[PDB]
C-alpha cells in the first residue's frame, strides 16, 4: 500500500466538520471511517480511509483518540489536517 500526503482546510459547519474519526484509544494514528457527503469535510475533500497525521501543523499521529478529538472540537471555526491517503486504491 503506497500512500500520499495532502493538506486540507475545513470550515466548521453547524453540526461540525462532518466525519467520524476512528482509531487508537491510546505510531499509526486515528483515521476517517466515513464522511458526510453534504458536510464541510466532504466539501474540503476529506475521504474515508484518510489517516490523520497533523492537526493545525502539529504532529498528532501518536496521540490518544480523545486528545485528537478534543483538539479537533477546540480548533474553533477552522481546522487544518495533514493526512495520508491510499494511492493504489
Amino acid at each position: 500500500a503506497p500512500e500520499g500526503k495532502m493538506d486540507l482546510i475545513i470550515m466548521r459547519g453547524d453540526k461540525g466538520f462532518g466525519f467520524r474519526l476512528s482509531g487508537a484509544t491510546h505510531a499509526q494514528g486515528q483515521w476517517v471511517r466515513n464522511v458526510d457527503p453534504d458536510g464541510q469535510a466532504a466539501r474540503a475533500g476529506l475521504q474515508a480511509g484518510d489517516r490523520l497525521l497533523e492537526l493545525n501543523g502539529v504532529d498528532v499521529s501518536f496521540w490518544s483518540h480523545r486528545k485528537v478529538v478534543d483538539e479537533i472540537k477546540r480548533s474553533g471555526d477552522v481546522v487544518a489536517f495533514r493526512i495520508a491517503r491510499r494511492l493504489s486504491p
Partner: peptide, 7 residues
Amino acid sequence: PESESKV
C-alpha cells in the same frame, strides 16, 4: 470499534 467519534 477501536474508538469512534463524530466531529
